[PDB]
C-alpha cells in the first residue's frame, strides 16, 4: 500500500520473531 510503512515494516519482522524465541525460553 504506502512504500514509506513498507522501509519500516521490513525491520518489524525481528519484532514478531522476537516474540517466537522468547516464547521458546518459557516451553524449554
Keep these: 500500500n504506502e512504500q ?3 522501509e519500516l515494516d521490513k525491520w518489524a519482522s525481528l519484532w514478531n520473531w522476537f516474540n517466537i524465541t522468547n ?5 524449554k
Design 4 to 6: 514509506e510503512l513498507l
Design 23 to 27: 516464547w521458546l525460553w518459557y516451553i
